[PDB]
Design a binder for this molecule. Structure first.
Ligand SMILES: Cc1noc(C)c1-c1cc(S(=O)(=O)NC2CCCC2)c2cccnc2c1
Ligand SMILES: Cc1noc(C)c1-c1cc(S(=O)(=O)NC2CCCC2)c2cccnc2c1
Length: 114
């Protein structure tokens, strides 16, 4: 579906996050071979990244905004679960997610199809 809320997530939320200076590690799926993490996919069962979310927005994959919000959430949660507490990537994820939440607080409240 195209909905008012999904449009907002695309044009306001994703727009802001995608261009952020800390976004780069999250713009494509985690490549476990490249990063040297043979257990990544053993620990993280549902990988997610902003490249995938952007494409889903662009291709009208989502039926409701809440679905897209859960993908954003999964991407951040994966990061917090996998990485060590002191890893810089955790700080970068937190920074992005703060913007995610700030923007989500201003999303249109009633979802309507277009
Ligand atoms: C401005 C304007 N003047 O005439 C038209 C037509 C627009 C308009 C309408 C929509 S929408 O109807 O698809 N979604 C609405 C629902 C919530 C707010 C946007 C946009 C959608 C995306 C970008 N520009 C949009 C601009
Ligand atoms: C693991 C992992 N789990 O979620 C994400 C996201 C990652 C992650 C981690 C690294 S890194 O640890 O090599 N560099 C850190 C240093 C500070 C920036 C990230 C990447 C390195 C390159 C590309 N993607 C990366 C993605």
């Amino acid at each position: 579906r195209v909905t008012n809320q999904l449009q907002y997530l695309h044009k306001v939320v994703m727009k802001a996050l995608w261009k952020h200076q800390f976004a780069w590690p999250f713009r494509q799926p985690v490549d476990a071979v490249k990063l040297g993490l043979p257990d990544y996919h053993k620990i993280i069962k549902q990988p997610m990244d902003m490249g995938t979310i952007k494409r889903r927005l662009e291709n009208n994959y989502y039926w409701a905004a809440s679905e897209c919000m859960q993908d954003f959430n999964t991407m951040f949660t994966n990061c917090y679960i996998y990485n060590k507490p002191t890893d810089d990537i955790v700080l970068m994820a937190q920074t992005l997610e703060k913007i995610f939440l700030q923007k989500v607080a201003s999303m249109p409240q009633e979802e309507q199809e277009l």
